[PDB]
Structure formats: structure tokens, C-alpha cells
Amino acid sequence: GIPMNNPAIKRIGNHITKSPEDKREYRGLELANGIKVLLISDPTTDKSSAALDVHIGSLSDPPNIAGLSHFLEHMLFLGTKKYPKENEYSQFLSEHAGSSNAFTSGEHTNYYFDVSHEHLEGALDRFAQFFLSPLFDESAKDREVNAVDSEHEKNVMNDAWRLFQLEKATGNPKHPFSKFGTGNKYTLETRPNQEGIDVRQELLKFHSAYYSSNLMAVVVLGRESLDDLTNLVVKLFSEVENKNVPLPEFPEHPFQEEHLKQLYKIVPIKDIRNLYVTFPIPDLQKYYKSNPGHYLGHLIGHEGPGSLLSELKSKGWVNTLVGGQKEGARGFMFFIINVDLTEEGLLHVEDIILHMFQYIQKLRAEGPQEWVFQELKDLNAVAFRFKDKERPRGYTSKIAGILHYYPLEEVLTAEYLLEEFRPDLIEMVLDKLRPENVRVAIVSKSFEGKTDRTEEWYGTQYKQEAIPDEVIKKWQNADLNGKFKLPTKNEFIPTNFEILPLEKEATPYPALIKDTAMSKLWFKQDDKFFLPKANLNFEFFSPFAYVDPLHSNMAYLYLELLKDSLNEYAYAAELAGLSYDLQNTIYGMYLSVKGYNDKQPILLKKIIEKMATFEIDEKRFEIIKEAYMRSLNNFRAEQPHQHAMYYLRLLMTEVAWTKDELKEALDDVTLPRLKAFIPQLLSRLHIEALLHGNITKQAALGIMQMVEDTLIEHAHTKPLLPSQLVRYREVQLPDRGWFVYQQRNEVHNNSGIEIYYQTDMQSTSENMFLELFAQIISEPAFNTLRTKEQLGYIVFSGPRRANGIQGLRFIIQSEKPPHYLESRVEAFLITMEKSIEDMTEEAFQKHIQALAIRRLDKPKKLSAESAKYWGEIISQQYNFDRDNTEVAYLKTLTKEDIIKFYKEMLAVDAPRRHKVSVHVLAREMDSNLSQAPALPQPEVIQNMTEFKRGLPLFPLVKPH
Amino acid sequence: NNPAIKRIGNHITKSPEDKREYRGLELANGIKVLLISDPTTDKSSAALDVHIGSLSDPPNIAGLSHFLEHMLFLGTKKYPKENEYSQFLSEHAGSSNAFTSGEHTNYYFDVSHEHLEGALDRFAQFFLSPLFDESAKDREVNAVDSEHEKNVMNDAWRLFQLEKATGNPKHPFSKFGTGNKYTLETRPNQEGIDVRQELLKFHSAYYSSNLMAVVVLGRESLDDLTNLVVKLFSEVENKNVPLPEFPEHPFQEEHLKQLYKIVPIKDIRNLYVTFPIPDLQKYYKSNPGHYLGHLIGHEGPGSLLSELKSKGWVNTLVGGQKEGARGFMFFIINVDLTEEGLLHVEDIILHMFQYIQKLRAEGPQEWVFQELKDLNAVAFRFKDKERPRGYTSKIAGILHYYPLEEVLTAEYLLEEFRPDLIEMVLDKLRPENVRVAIVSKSFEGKTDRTEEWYGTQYKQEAIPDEVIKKWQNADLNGKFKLPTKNEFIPTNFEILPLEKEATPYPALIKDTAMSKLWFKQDDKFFLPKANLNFEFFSPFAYVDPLHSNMAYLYLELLKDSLNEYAYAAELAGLSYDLQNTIYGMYLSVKGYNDKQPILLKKIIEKMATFEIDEKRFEIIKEAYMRSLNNFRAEQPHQHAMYYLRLLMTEVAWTKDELKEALDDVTLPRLKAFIPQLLSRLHIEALLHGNITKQAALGIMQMVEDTLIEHAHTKPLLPSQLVRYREVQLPDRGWFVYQQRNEVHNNSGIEIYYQTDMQSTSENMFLELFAQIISEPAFNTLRTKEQLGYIVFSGPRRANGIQGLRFIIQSEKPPHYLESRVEAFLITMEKSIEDMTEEAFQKHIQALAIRRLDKPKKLSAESAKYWGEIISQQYNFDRDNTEVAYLKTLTKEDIIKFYKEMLAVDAPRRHKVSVHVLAREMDSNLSQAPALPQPEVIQNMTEFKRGLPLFPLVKPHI
Ligand SMILES: C[C@H](NC(=O)c1ccc(F)c(F)c1)c1cn([C@@H](CC(=O)NO)Cc2ccc3c(c2)CCCC3)nn1
Ligand SMILES: C[C@H](NC(=O)c1ccc(F)c(F)c1)c1cn([C@@H](CC(=O)NO)Cc2ccc3c(c2)CCCC3)nn1
Ligand SMILES: [Zn+2]
């Protein structure tokens, strides 16, 4: 007997293919109006999520109003006919453990939120109106244009945004690819006013012309059953009108003939030296079951023995390489090979590019290789079998995007499983990687003064030149180069995926299973996820890692040199799902090994062995030391607010070597000096480790002792004394004090500010006063300081934790000068006093429950659990049950508790107010609305050292 | 003319740089008297020396002479209030001491200059009519007993008494002179002796005016001083006592050619060689024994020590005449011993006689005697002006030995060469006349004798006459040579003229990334001398125990290497000290400015280019290992103070940490260490004395250039010049740290009440309170309750923080000591309510005088400034501004300061206690308050992390 058809549903999909380890339940369907839908039922999830991706983006901006898609994206957050309160949507999310975001790309506008699972329907309802009845209020439009301006302004002096738009500006100007997608105040307000455009009508036109149900995919994840999710989606989205909008296509490449064989010389903001090589290629999207693009990218971008990178690195010309297909838009794609340049490299660009064509020629000579394809197919197959479970918010967004590109039943698998070996397609793409189709760009300060063009939106300085035919023909005649061998079988590919059974003594939290003078080992066998993976975390302590700038530099260079040496060997492991990380700290070194447990002990042994017996190559030492010098100078070009956060760290930590000190102590680092440093650093160590995953207690002790034994045999390591294991303390500000430290950012023409109200050492009590207060002000501060007052795109509030201390911190990047932003944050604080007093007890309990849901959100993947434990270990608080006990305590707080807290610690007139403010001035600066209170005269910090010496130092928190 | 004065001495010969006025005189009762007029002195002083001592003790009451000396402090017929002598002094910026040798008892004090008469009056009565009160006599016996106890386990006192016990038992030299509760109470009681009668009898029999010298220093004119001393001292009864003599030597012929093996407390290895010799004191104008000690004890090239050091047997040597008593003396040669030296004592002594035999062959050398004569002359001419209290005490002692007009010069100004006396003394220094003692822990378990008084374990054997004869036949050794003409003798004593912009305090005359240079040309003393002070700051001097061990060994090895070269200079009045610190290195060069640049450059150059001798490094490393262990045998109160310091400082390595880490110091490791250490540095310096601003800049530049050329030194960053903070204790806190001393059977305690950071107000609150309780605390805890011999109260200053501290070493357990200190604090609270406003103001003036007491020699003015400089406060005018503030304080300010910071119920009390238990100890009266349950510290690291740290003090200018 035949089924009863729901008319709001054009069709239900067949089984949506999923990983057998995926316990979430799935159903795909297409509504009658053509919205594509994936429903995800996960009865355990603490947060629900929904995303909608409109298949329309910046390439459809009208030509006379650049950035209209983007501006529209913003205005949809700001009120609808059925929910006219401008911040209804944000407020609702914030008060139910929710958040939201959206982005506009060239062909997609993607909106998504997450929310407590008991409020999916109410959040989805406010959300759906975005697509039915936006208000596009005039006052709202006149304000929000400033957020978009300010967003563009953060990017203006950023080299990646500059190069991104410069590529677009050197192709066919008549092509939509050349459009400027962000928008700014000029293109969205001032130019439109000179031209008599009514921008609220243009929003109304775009929304109506393009927000059509046939260009829309929707994803909803919640606790509810698939059948209840279907009704909910049908109820809310069936009424989006279908205007059968044809999907935009761009079949003519933006790089035609006159744009090939070109050479661009670009001046950067930071002192960086990069080489970019680009070939136009056909759109490979429809070939997703073979992925010829990625086959070639895997080979050309290989970093192992025989690779292209390995030879350019032996030559001293490049340190890093990226290679593979780059997205374009429906109808055109690119294939890139970008490398960074040593000083010599910059003088051998022509030979670098010859070597790239020699490697490409090697691939033509050998032809396509099914076994190579077999390796990629098998690796992708295991990655997908054992994919980590995702946070719902990111996941709904990702899938909404790709419902546009794949049959319902394949949305989950299409971007992972390979099925077809297509040597024809591999040849096809390979034939386009030829000198006659190349574009070359060189980014170096060395072109300062020698450019004759200016890209209009960012101000990028560059020159354009035809590549000489003599050069092209030299490249077309690339013979073979015997240093180039294809890769061999990847021995690191794992094969033991067995999940060891849970030992009869396994523990809900990590256990201290070894406590010696040398090593403190924490262990936990995975009892939640059951994937064949493990995380091995090691903190190494040495007093000599941070004793003075010169030593800090040497501890950096040692790990950079070490990683550089291991890189060819470890690349095989990285492709095989086994990755590691090694970075110096203010206490020593951090080593982290992550992924499939099978072959982890092999890689870990190679790393420790290298550490203990390292032979520096002086050619590599000189190159990496020069790159490090640059890195430190380049900090000058980070964001104003990033600077502000950096200076605050320097002020409030007992010891802190500044970039400039580091830079001044980098000159006296000689190879002999470093050679002596390493054995010294390794001579006395303490190791504290977390091992957590698909391993037994016996394996983990063996792993730890393996590390110890290796250090002992080769570096003669002996234990540090307990009295040497000191951590740095935080500065203790005086009751009623207010210090301001002022610097200038000499690159960006916005200011930044951080405001820190230090409260007290961390304890259950103080932690939850601060956190609940921060929940209560979170949305209102964003809505006041950014949506209503439009102080800047970047506006943040929340807790600030360091060295066992804590407080509340505001961060803002803005047009306006720091003293003004201070007023406005202060004006805002006063108004919260009255709001919290007038809040009903039901609303107050609502904020408690929001915080509670957020804190008891349980991690979805192993590495997220590992990091929760690692934080407890690094902070030496070891409070692994923290979440249950702090939430239990939260639930007993009263609004009078919070008001007493605010009036004791935060209020302007508060007897224990501790306030320090970093002011970062914009490049060009000089040293109605609610009432800002009156502020004391602030003590200006002129010398960080004297400031610290004159104040006490907090204790360090007591362990658990 | 005057009947009270027998005789009035002629001009007393003085140095032409001495601006003091002298008058000598003999009283009619035979008291010899020197009067000293110095109208600038802030403290006046007096001293009386009686030529009677322990050697005259009754044979049945060992220690009576010493016991008597204590008793004289405890009241007279005219001033019967027991503590009246000390209390008067304490309330008038004054102090006092006394000691008993074998033939002298020496009493002295100092006091505010406006109160000499009142002080001297109460002092005089000690020699007229002591009360020898029975109650006081039964209390003070305990102070003398615990004075002996602190010595019992001290290796210097054991050997001192053991030599005495190995002489002729019938000679007074063998007497135990300290006495203890057994000899001064328990045995006399059991034997029927009335100790009070015995004291009275000894005092009337021997405290005779004919055996006394008196020195008095004041602002008064010489005439007024004459009348004052006559008023107070001519009353003294003259019983014409014969000066005791001891013509027979305590070592007779059965005591010679004797060998002694002695077990120490500390791990120390020592060789003592002694010869008896006639009393040389009558020969003082030619000083034969000192001529010979100059040579036998020389440390320069060709010397006896130089060869014993180069064979790796000995590290230090002392030789010369050692005092005995009227009748007998000794000549000594004492060396310490390496591990090898211990196995070669026979050859060490053979080398000794080889060197003596050379001196017999060459015969006396007048040019040597002449060089001593000329150096001593320079020494006396430019002698630093002495402290009043120590000066009167010294002179009163020597007035017995020299004519009045020459008492200042007798010990300095040699007359004519008497080679016959030299050959006479030399003739006694022969194997048949030797006594030999070895001290090593290698004799543990191999001894058979026990010294009575201290318990010392030892063995006595004869030296085999085969060994005597080998020493008798000691050939000449080519390695020995007389010293050369001292090329460091100063010859330019010109005082540079005051520069026209010279400053009264040191001035910051250079301020680079590498050097802060503080300079002051001397404007007070105008002697041809300069003090040169350098702090070398490096973060690698103390980063970890291994690095601290290497900074120590570096400086020891460097001093060791410089020693022969630097001996000449030291003989010529030019000396240096070179010490590792927790921030780097301290170098001081003091003395005649003439050849200072020569020495300083040699030191800085040896630093920057040092080549370690592997054999020295082994030997000095082993010595260092030993001194770290030997800390176990220091005294309990010394342990107390050390733990407190290892708990209130941010960073501090323990002896056990340094000791473990020592095995990891290798010669290669140390070679790598030094250049690193020197690679980065910051130099802060004080140059002060007979030098110009341009000369100073040139010394500082010489130091920088030598470092920069040979060691590639570069400046440190300002942000690296960090100093350690003190632990900040919690309001109402009480912490207790407990340790055991394994060696002494006494306990120690330090009690620290941390107040606040140093500040003009907090400094003078604390100092005034200390002043007010100083005497009451000593009187209560020592005189009256007899807790122990060592009882101290005062300020503690460390790392910019300060408080009040009590230190006590006692037989009683430390918790008991804690309650008695708490009891004292309560009773002080009543005392201060009751105290009249005049008594309060006396305490204010007393502290004022002390703080404003200006310094008398260059070294002491230098130190006052150096304290400002290493403390980074730079408050060179501190005394005037602080004393001004002090005068504004009221009794009420002090009471509230007490009630807020110190009282048992104070809201801001911060109390830490270190309890050092005696070896065998276990873990009416005014009433002690009730105390909280002290937080017990088990771990210094944890203790620290859990508390805040104070700030540092801001500089002044
Ligand atoms: C992630 C971040 N939200 C917050 O930090 C935040 C924190 C607490 C709150 F209570 C709250 F409402 C927001 C964010 C995302 N976007 C924009 C992303 C983007 O740039 N599309 O082009 C999207 C956007 C555009 C306009 C508006 C909002 C969000 C929020 C309501 C006000 C107007 N801007 N900021
Ligand atoms: C130098 C030290 N004085 C103090 O600490 C001190 C501090 C502040 C005062 F207010 C005070 F009265 C004493 C010291 C010297 N001696 C003795 C030195 C020694 O042992 N000869 O054989 C001499 C001695 C013998 C007995 C007595 C006193 C002094 C003082 C009065 C009580 C009885 N004992 N203690
Ligand atoms: Zn945006």
C-alpha cells in the first residue's frame, strides 16, 4: 500500500551514509519550495544548532554598491516584523547558552547559531524570520554600516587581505571575481548618497531577488526525534517563497590570455618574503569521487624524502611550501605552489620556478599511479571511520554549505571518500601546469620604492611585468632532475585500530600513576569515545629556558631547529593521522603527540632521541635565526587590540622578556653558544605529563620511562630539586588604584584598549561571582558598546585568568581614542547596577541556567577532554571535578550576592577596585548618550620594571 | 702640689694626625691613669684594667676571678639597684662589657658625652664596695654556666684548655678559668665553701689600687678630667699587692718531645707545633719574637708556607710568639692539613726545621728589622682614629707595661736591633724542645684519654728519638729564601686638596648601562687612604645550587692564586676582600692610596683571565665540602637565624642543596662557568677617600676596560637587575619551623614579629620601641630569669622589610622560651603606660645620640654609604631626617604602634618562630598569655608559594 504524501515535502531521502562510529541519526529531505534539508538527531547533545546557507554571495553584489551581500548579512541580525526588538535574536541566544555567527563568501551567505537544547524551537523561530521579514530599520542601517567599515579597517593593513584582493584586481576587471566583497562606509553609505541610491530599498531588492527558497539549504541538530525535527522545519520554513532564481555561474576564467605569463612585485606590511605561483584550471568540483586536484597537490606539496620542498630547502632557498588546488567559484579554479623565501631564495626566484617545473615534469614522465591513489583512498577512509565527533554549531554550518553540492545521501561522505581512479583527469589537470599558463608574484620589502601601481581598496603597492619569453622557454625545457623521486609507501599508515578493553581499575578522571623527582605522570584510559587514538602531553621544566632573554632565544631556536630537522621524517606520519607539536615556554618546553595510537611510540622515540643528541646544521641555524629576527620585528604589525593584550601580560607577570629585549639578545646567539646551551638545558629537568587515550596504564608507564631513559642515556639528565619548581606570580594591585600604560601602534590606524579589573585569587566562590556577572553583562555590553554606540567591530567582555588570579576584562578596537572608550565602558557599568537590581528572580535564575549549561557541556572529542585536564595540570590546580562543584555552587548564588560582589570589587566607587588599563594609540593619534561617571586621576606607568618592583606579588593557588 | 696626684706625666707622645689631647698621671694610691680630651666625640668612655686574673684563682674555686667580674655589674653599696649600671647606660646611649684573662680583668663602657660623670660614678663603685648580693650570686652563676656551655663543643676552646691540661698540673696555667655551675656552686656547696665570702676575700685582697690602670675619654678639658678621676678613684684602697709571677715554665722536660692526637667536633685537620720560650716582654723595644714570626710566618715567595702549599700538604700557616704569662711564652707554628698533609706530618715538621735551620745559617738580618720598624712607623702615624670604647679598654690594659709618655707608641715604635736576642729565641726552636698536636677525625676510636673540662678525646705518645734526630739533622732546603724588599711599601702620603665641587655625600658621577659609580673625596679624616667597593651583579651567580657552588669556588681559587703576590701589599697596609654574594661578587680594596691601582689591576686581570690549577681545585673543593657539613656544629642560635633566613627570602639554597650539587662540579664545568658568569655584568661601585673625581672615573674605566678586553663583558638589561623580596605574612599569623641541632645540648629560638616595609615612620617606631625594651628585655630574660647566656632583642632588617626580633640560646625548650618572651611583652605594656614623660624623652635622646654618632675612620663612613648603595635606597642623609622625625614621636604613637603591630591581640601581628632543639631534647613568674595553635611549616617551598611577597623600597635620589 502506497504512502500518504505530505505536500510541504517534495521528497525524503534514502539512508544518509555515515561512519559506523557515528551514533547521531540522520534524515535528508527537500521541501516543496526546494529548500534542501538535513535533520540531525542526537539525544545526548546539550546544545542544539541550526544553520542556513543561501547560495548567494559577494559575486552577486550590484556593481554600483560593493559589499551589499555582506551588509545584508549584518542587517538580518537586527530585527524582523515578528520579532522587532533589535537584539531579540542575540539576547535570546545569550540567555540560553547560545551564540551565533554568519559569514559572506563569494557564492554563499551562511548563518548559524547554537542554543541550549531546551530552546531550539524558540531560537529557530527568531532565526527563520531572517528569511521572511527583515525590518532593515533606517536607524539600524545607519549604525551597523560602522561595524562593517571597522571590519574592513582591521583588514586594511593585513598582508593576507591585501594579497587576497590584489589577485582579484589583476584579473579581468569586467568579471565579478574582481569585486570587493567586504564593503565599507564609502561603498555602502557615502558614495550611495552622492548617487541618490536609497540603500534600504536596495537591501529590500536583494533580499527579495536572491533570498529564494530554491537557493537555500538548512541543517538542524537537536535532541528531538527525526520526525519531530521534520515537522518543526516544515512549520518554520515552508513559507519562504520560491522565486526559481537561477544559480549564478561563472564559466569564463577571470584570468584570460593577457593575464598569463605575468609577474607581480608586491610590497608587504610585515618584513616577509614570499613567492606565489598560480595556474588557472577548470572547475574540478564535479569530479569529487576522484579528486585529481588533490592527487597532484599531495605529490607537488609533499615534504618528505625526494620531494620538491626537500630540494629547495637543501639549496637554502625556501623553508615552507604549499601546493594544490585553490577554490574559485562555480566555473573556475586555481592550482597554486606558494613558498617562502630565504634571503638567497629571493635572488633565485627564476631557479626556484625552474625546479618546480622539473618536478612537474617528473610527474608527467612517470604517469598517474594507482597505488598513490590507493594510499589516499585508504587514509581518507580511516579518517572518516574514526572522525572525531564535531561541536554542533560548526557542524550544522559546514553541512549547510555542502548540501548545495552533493546528493542528500552523500553530504556526510562526499568530501572524504574517494571511489574512482581517474588517470585521465589526473593528466588533464597536469597538462595545465605549464609555463604558458603561469602567474608569478613576489612579496618582498626589497621592492619598496620600485612600484608604479596602487590597488584601490587596500593601497597595496606593486608593479606588473610580462615574464620574458627567454624565461618561459627555459622553463618549458625543464629536463629531469635526479634529486626528485616520488614518495614511497607511507610506513606510518596505521593498521591496529583495536580498542583495548577498559581495565578493572580505570578512573573517571586522570590519575597520578608516577611521582618521582624526575617525572610526574598523569594517566587516563579513554572511557567515552572509543576511537583508536591517544594524546601524549609533556611539560619539561628547566630554570634555564627563561633565565634571561638570551636563553629564551636559544630555547626558541633549539626547538625551531629540531622541528626543521625532523620535518621530512615526520611528514609521512602527519599524512597518516599522527602529528606532534614542540614549542618553548616560560618554564621550558611543551611536547604534544596526537592521533592514531598504533605507531605513536615510534614517533615519540624519534623525537626524544633527536632532542638529546641534536647536531645543529649551521646553514639551517643561520636561516632560522634570520627568520626569527624578522618574526620579532613583525610583531609591530599585529592588531592594536592584540598589542594591548600583550602589554597587559608583560605588566602583570613577575618576569617577561619583551620582543625588543629578545630582539636585542638575538644578536649575541652564536652557533657555539647554542651548542653549549642545549646540554645545559637538558642537564636538570622535571617532566610532568598527561597520557590519555586508547592506551593501558602499562603502556603509559612504558612511554613515560622511555622518555626518561632516553634523556638520561644521551643527555645525562638528572632531576631538578623541588625548591626550583617555582611558577611566576601575578602583580597585586592596590585597593582603589588605577594604572594606565600607553603605547602606540605604528601600523594600524585604529586604537586598541584592554581594561582589567582584577578581583582576587581563584577559588570556587570568586570564580563563580565573576563568571555569573560576566554572563549577565555579556550581551548587554556587546549590544551597548558595539551595536548601539558603534565603538568598533572588535568588542569583548569576559573573565581574564592568569597565574591563579582573575578579573573582568573589556577589549575594544576602535576609531576613537582610548580615554573615550574608558568613559563608555564606565558609563555602561553603571547602567548594569540598575538592570541587575530590577531583574526578576526568574530572569536571574535564567542566567544561572545559561552559565550552568555552558560549564557542564561535555566534550565531544578526545582532544577536547585532554585539554580540559591539561589546563588543570598546567595551572597546578589539579581540580578535575571542577565543573560539577562550581556549577553546584553557582546554583546557590543570589542576585544580592552578585550585587555585593559588584559593589565591593567592580563599581567605580568600590573599596577594593583594582583597575589597570592598556591604551594602544592608533598610528596617527596624539597623546543623548548615558552619563560616564567621573574617574580618579590615573597613575601612568612609564617603566614596567619600576611598576612591578613597587607592588606586592600574589601567592600561587594551592593544589587540590 | 696636689696630694692626690703622685706624679703628672710629660707630653704623651702621639701621632701628629691624632687631634685628641692626652695627659698621663699616677694617683697617690698607685693607680696609673691616662686622660683623653676630644671635644668632638659623641660618646665618652672609660675603662679600668686590674692586673689580676684567672691564674690567681683559688685552687679550690676554678673561675672565681671570672665569676667576680660578672658580679660587679649587679650592684654596689651606693647604687644598690641591681641593674642600675646597665639601665643608666641604656638610657644614655651607652653600652658596656668586661673580660677576664689569666692576668687581667678589664672593664669598660661608653655613654652619651653629656653624661660621663654619672656613668663614671656608678662604674667606680665596682672597685670600692660591690654588694655581691646572695640572690644575684645564685642567679648569675647560671649565666656563667651557659657561657661555658656555648664553648664546650667549640673546637677552639677545647684545644685551648687541652694544651693547659697537658702541661705541669702543679702550675696555675693548667687551671680552668671560665668556671661553671659545678666549680662555682655544686662543688663549693658540697665542700662547705661560702662562695660569697670567697668573692669578698678575693676582691679585698687583689682589687688593689696599685694594680689598676684607668683610661677616661670625654669632651671635658684635661683639667676637668683630672679633677673628675681624682674625685672618684683616689678613694680606692691600696694594699700594695705584689704582681704575681710565674718564672717556672708550665712545660718541663717530661712535657717536651710529646705528640698529641686529638679528635675534633667539626671535620677539621690541623697541626700545632709549640716551643716554650722565656718571657720576651722586657725586650719589647727590639721585639725578637715578632722578627722571627715575621719570617717563619711569611706567605710570600720562598716562604715555608709556599713550599708546604706547593707540595699540597698545607693551605694556611701561622707562626710567631704567643703570650703565656709573666714568666713564660710560646713560639707556635700552626698549619691546617689537606688529606695528603695528614699522611705527611713528619715531613711537614722536617720542612719547618729546615727553614729554622736556614735562619740559623744566614744569621739575623738588620735590613729586615729595619723594614718592620719603618712600616710600623707609617702604621702608627696614619692609624685610623679608634672607637672610644675599644680605645680606652686597650690602653688601660697596656698602661701596666709601658711608661706613660710612651704608652701610645710602645707597641708600634721599635728601637734598636738586638740580634743577640733573636739568636737567643732561635736557640729554643729545636726538636728537643717541641710539642706536636694533630687534630683529625681519623683518630675517632683510636684514643685513650679524656680531658676533664670539655671531654676532648685524645691520645698522648712520645715522639720517637729516631724522629727527633731526623729533625735535628735537617739539611738546608734550596726552596727556602728570605723575603725580598717589600715593593708595596707606600711612599706618597700627599693628601690631595679638596676639589672645588667636592660633595659631603657620595655623588653619582657615572651612570651607564654597565656602571653606576658613586664617588666622594674624603672631607673628614685626611689620611692617605682610600676604600674601593665594587658589586659585580650577574644572574648566574645564584640561579641554582650548582651555579652558587661555582661562584664560591671561583673566588676561593682566585684568592688562593693571588695570595703570595698580595701578601707584600697586606704587610704594606693594602688589603682586599673578594666574596661571592647572592647577586654576584663583592670586591673591596682598602688602604694606602699610593699603590692601590697596581693591586686592583692585578685582581681584575686575574679575574678576567683565570687559569685553574687542577690540584688547587681538588683541594679547595674538598675544603668547601667540609665547611658545608661543618655547619652542623654551629650553635643553636646560629641555626635559628639561618633557618629564618631560609624561610623569609624569595630564593635561598640550603646547605644540603649546595652539598649535593657539589659532586656535580667538575674542573671542565667550572672552566665553562667563569666566562659565562663574566659575559654579562653590571658594576655598582663606591670609591671614597684620598682621590679626585678624575681619578675615580679612571679606576672605574680601568675595571670596565679589563673586563671588556679579556672577558667580552656586556651590560645587563635594567629589567634583569632584580632583587629578592621577603615573604609577606598574614594578619594574625603564627608560623613555627622546627629543626634539631645534633651537636650542642642547648636549644635556640629566633622570634620575628614582621611589622612593615621600611619607611621613615615605620623605621623610627621600630627603633624607638627596641630602645625602650632593650635593657628591660636583657634584664628580664637574662639577668632575672636566667634563660641563657645569649639573649638578644632588636630590629631585623631584610630585603626592605623589617620587624622586631628576639634571639635566645638556652637549656630550656623553645616552646618555654616562647612563652617567657610573650610574658615579657605584656609586662612591657604596663611599663610603657607607667613611664613618665621624662623617661620617654631620655629614650628618645638616647636613640638620637646613637643614630647621629658620626664615624671616626674612613672604613666606617664608607660602610654607612655602602649600606645605602647595596640596599638600593641611597638615602645618604638618612640619619638627620630620621632623627628629626624621631623627636616628634610621642609615647602615645608608640603605644598604638605596639597595640596594632606587636601585642598578642594585635590586628596586624605577623609572627614567625624558628625552634632549634638541643641534641637530646623532645618535640612567682609573670604569667604568659594564651597562644593560638601555630601553623607548623613542614616545607619551605610550599610555605612560600602560599603567601604574598612584599614590594621593594623605592630609591631616594
Ligand atoms: C562572534 C561575534 N559575536 C560576539 O562577539 C557576541 C558576543 C556576545 C553577544 F551577546 C553577542 F550578541 C555577540 C560576531 C559575529 N559577527 C558578525 C560576523 C560577520 O562578520 N559577518 O560578516 C555577524 C553579526 C553581525 C551583526 C551583529 C551580530 C553578529 C550580533 C548582534 C549585533 C549585530 N560579529 N561579531
Ligand atoms: C655585651 C653584652 N651585653 C648585652 O647584650 C646587653 C644589652 C643591653 C643591655 F641593656 C644590657 F644590660 C646588656 C654582654 C656582656 N656580657 C659579659 C661579657 C662576659 O661574658 N664577660 O666574662 C659582661 C656582663 C656580665 C654580667 C652582667 C652584664 C654584663 C650586664 C648587666 C647584667 C649582668 N654579657 N653580656
Ligand atoms: Zn561582517
Ligand SMILES: [Zn+2]
Ligand atoms: Zn663571662
